[PDB]
Amino acid sequence: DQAGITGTWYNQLGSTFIVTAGADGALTGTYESAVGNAESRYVLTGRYDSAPATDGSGTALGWTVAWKNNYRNAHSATTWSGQYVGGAEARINTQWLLTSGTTEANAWKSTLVGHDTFTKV
Amino acid sequence: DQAGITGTWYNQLGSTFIVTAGADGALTGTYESAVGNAESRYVLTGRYDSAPATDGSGTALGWTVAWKNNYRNAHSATTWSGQYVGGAEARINTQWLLTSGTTEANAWKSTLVGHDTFTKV
Amino acid sequence: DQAGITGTWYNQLGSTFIVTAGADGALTGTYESAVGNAESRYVLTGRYDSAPATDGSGTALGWTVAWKNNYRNAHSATTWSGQYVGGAEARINTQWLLTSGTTEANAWKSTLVGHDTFTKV
Amino acid sequence: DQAGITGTWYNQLGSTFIVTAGADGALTGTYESAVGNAESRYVLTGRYDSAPATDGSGTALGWTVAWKNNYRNAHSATTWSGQYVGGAEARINTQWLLTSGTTEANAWKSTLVGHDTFTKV
């Protein structure tokens, strides 16, 4: 699924996920969030299962963005964990965790959780 | 916190997290899980906030492992989202999402969630 | 939103959520899962914000099912945490945590996480 | 585990969880949070597995608090999903989801996730 994953994806918020899948299981690219304390592109890296099951299952993958670039620093990082599902309506179905750096006193509220669905259109 | 993060970390399960923090915000290294469908080291990559707040807050970071190596393939990926807290008892406090590749019929049960605390000892 | 919440709801899996919202903030009713180790109705209870904000925000709520009834016992419990959004296309948007009873050795994999959207049709 | 669960529990934040386990699987009581937009006691309800496995596994349970009482209204609800582990050092090990009522534009950041461990001391 190197060819299936590589490209430009869009989620339900209108964020843009630009990724290259390497033969070795690497994910590289950029993320642009339509929401939150974010502007322009941020570096992402991650991993995917480069030899998935042949039993109709999706392809497990994940990636990280740290919300620092040349424009802004939100002192936070999001990880998306999900699976790629190929076919006419290809999708990447994810759940995510967004952790902010906090004081010890605020650590109980450090982490947001949500779900993003990415499509090729 | 490049120097603070770089090194060998251990979680409460006895897993080993070996990481290098790059000046650019990169995380690279290997993960060895003490539990689950796993043996030996797996590649990891991720990101951290390379210019954190100076107000006593932790340093946001995340990383991904796809559970494929030369020995086993669990057709799954874990992402850890958390923060590094420096000092005498340095810690990386994380929450994680483990997604398996599934059929559509099993996708409701694709994702485990948990929490790992990493220490230098 | 007592009247708005009270009734029969259906999620994307075809599960049936039957609830009564009490003037005091109580949620009572039954849940029938279309998937998993489940048959027929299970008791649920929960709580909702009985005096929500008047600024266009949704209404926070949550509920629990323990997966024991007269037919089956899956030794697990799900909690749904979410918000009710009123209007022509009323919705309850949730994230959920499903914890199984485990040995200590399996506790790292005790908890599934997912997201359900409930509608009135 | 009706007798094992019923009583006063305390988490790592110094919150107080007062619960009664019913023969029928009900959980009733009050919660007092040491942190956040909270004062005094709030109603809770939930469910637990009243016929757990006899193979050394914990007892699955969950409960909800809506953060409205006679003093404050945070327009939010937390659900805890976890398991009770009996013995000399009895524990309730939970993960939780805290959903706030939001506008549609803020719904992506509606839900915090965390983990609480409750003990009898």
D95 touches chain B (CB under 8 A): yes
- Interacting residues of C55 by C-beta distance below 8 A, sequence separation 6+: D103
Are D86 and C101 within 8 A, CB to CB?
Answer: no
Are D100 and D67 within 8 A, CB to CB?
Answer: no
Number of helical H runs and strand E runs in chain B: 1, 8
Computed on alpha carbons and rounded to an integer, the radius of gyration of chain C in Å comes to: 15
Which helix (H) or strand (E) covers residue B57, if one does? none
Q: Which chains touch A (3 or more CB pairs under 8 A)?
A: B, C, D
Total Cβ atoms within 10 A of residue B23: 7
- Pull the structure tokens for residue B46: 């991720």
Contact A113 D109 (CB under 8 A): no
Under 8 Å CB pairs connecting chains A and C tally to 8
* Distance spanning both ends of chain A, measured CA to CA: 18
Cα–Cα dist C38/C74, whole Å: 7
B9 Cα distance to chain centroid: 10
- Pull the structure tokens for residue C106: 């399996």
- Nearest residue, CB atoms, B48 vs list A61, A77, A78: A77
Question: Is the torsion defined by CA of D9, D11, D14, D19 positive or negative?
Answer: negative
Burial class for D30, CB neighbours closer than 10 Å (0-12, 13-18, 19+):
middle
Experimental method: X-ray
**Closest CA–CA distance from residue C110 to any residue of chain A (Å):** 18
Cα–Cα dist D48/D60, whole Å: 6
Cα–Cα dist B57/A77, whole Å: 14
- Pull the structure tokens for residue B103: 């059929």
> What residue ranges define each of the domains in chain B, with the CATH number in brackets?
2-119 (2.40.128.30)
Cα–Cα dist A65/A45, whole Å: 7
Q: Decide: helix, strand or coil at residue B77.
A: strand
- Interacting residues of D109 by C-beta distance below 8 A, sequence separation 6+: A35, A36, A98, A112, A114, D102
Are B79 and A64 within 8 A, CB to CB?
Answer: yes
Angle at the Cα of D64 (from C7 to D26), degrees rounded to 5? Answer: 80
Q: List the resolution, Å.
A: 1.5
Q: Which of C40, C79, B98 has its CA nearest to residue D83? A: C79
Are C114 and C32 within 8 A, CB to CB?
Answer: no
B113 touches chain D (CB under 8 A): yes
Cα–Cα dist A120/A10, whole Å: 6
Which helix (H) or strand (E) covers residue C105, if one does? none
Are D62 and D80 within 8 A, CB to CB?
Answer: yes
Are A110 and A97 within 8 A, CB to CB?
Answer: no
Q: Decide: helix, strand or coil at residue B35.
A: coil
B95 touches chain D (CB under 8 A): yes
B117 touches chain D (CB under 8 A): no
Chain C hits for A114, Cβ within 8 Å: 95
Contact B83 A107 (CB under 8 A): yes
Cα–Cα dist C48/C86, whole Å: 14
**Closest CA–CA distance from residue D113 to any residue of chain A (Å):** 6
* Distance spanning both ends of chain C, measured CA to CA: 18
Burial class for B112, CB neighbours closer than 10 Å (0-12, 13-18, 19+):
buried
Are B19 and B12 within 8 A, CB to CB?
Answer: no
Are B88 and C94 within 8 A, CB to CB?
Answer: no
| Amino acid letter for position D65 | V
**DSSP for A56-119?**
S--EEEEEEEEEE-SS-EEEEEEEEEEEEE-STT-EEEEEEEEEEP--GGGGGG-EEEEEEEEE
Burial pattern D44-68, b for ≥16 Cβ within 10 A else e, equals bbbbbbbebbeeebbbbbbbbbbbb
- DSSP code at position B40: S
Are C121 and C38 within 8 A, CB to CB?
Answer: no
Contact A111 D113 (CB under 8 A): yes
